[PDB]
Design a protein around this ligand. Structure first.
Ligand SMILES: CC(=O)SCCNC(=O)CCNC(=O)[C@H](O)C(C)(C)COP(=O)(O)OP(=O)(O)OC[C@H]1O[C@@H](n2cnc3c(N)ncnc32)[C@H](O)[C@@H]1OP(=O)(O)O
Length: 203
């Protein structure tokens, strides 16, 4: 059936801190969670570049971003370094994370949330480009196939075999390259992140 659920989308406020930390725990393994302070930075320093999804009173989803000068600055950086790259006047929007409560996944929420973010970023003055550093979910199934080949592996159909990459693909993302050592604690992906970009010139 068609859900018919009352969803609200707004910028975070400081009061949302505890609920957003809770949301991080439920969506990601301990190795992939960002720490309490990074959540705080995002909602304190840059409320404009974040969105909270609420169902009733409850926070059920979040999408995070910051502004950087260019995607080259991401070469040879770990994820705990990226917060340092933020500049107020950065021409590139780096989407940092998308969080959907596991019980509410596979209902079109990720989709709707990302599309809104993309259109929201298009309308921000000065912004030329949107990039995200993602990761694979199913690589252990293809190991030891080289990841550089895995991230371009398409199915039938011509959509990417990895469901986390497909998610970006079907919203117009270009898979750019691998970012080795981006996530030190992510052994399933051999620490590698995946850089994707969005052409926003049409929106
Ligand atoms: C900003 C950044 O992206 S950087 C952060 C680092 N990580 C990332 O890059 C993002 C990682 N997260 C993801 O990509 C995940 O897919 C998530 C967390 C967004 C999943 O969120 P969801 O709300 O489940 O996404 P959504 O429901 O739109 O899509 C998931 C699948 O369900 C399908 N779906 C959509 N609506 C429905 C529905 N009503 N019923 C059943 N299935 C559905 C989609 O087609 C998709 O199918 P596929 O896996 O076969 O392609």
């Amino acid at each position: 059936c068609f859900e018919n659920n009352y969803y609200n989308l707004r910028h975070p406020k400081i009061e949302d801190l505890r609920d957003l930390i809770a949301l991080e725990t439920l969506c990601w393994s301990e190795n992939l969670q960002v720490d309490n302070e990074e959540i705080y930075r995002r909602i304190f320093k840059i409320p404009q570049g974040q969105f909270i999804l609420e169902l009733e009173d409850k926070i059920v989803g979040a999408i995070y971003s910051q502004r950087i000068d260019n995607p080259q600055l991401l070469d040879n950086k770990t994820c705990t370094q990226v917060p340092l790259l933020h500049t107020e006047s950065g021409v590139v929007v780096q989407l940092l994370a998308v969080n959907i409560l596991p019980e509410l996944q596979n209902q079109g929420l990720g989709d709707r949330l990302l599309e809104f973010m993309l259109q929201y970023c298009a309308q921000i003055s000065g912004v030329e480009k949107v990039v995200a550093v993602t990761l694979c979910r199913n690589y252990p199934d293809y190991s030891p196939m080289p990841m550089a080949e895995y991230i371009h592996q398409k199915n039938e159909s011509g959509l990417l075999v990895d469901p986390l990459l497909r998610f970006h693909q079907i919203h117009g993302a270009k898979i750019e390259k691998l970012l080795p050592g981006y996530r030190p604690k992510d052994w399933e992906n051999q620490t590698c992140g995946v850089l994707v970009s969005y052409d926003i010139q049409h929106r």
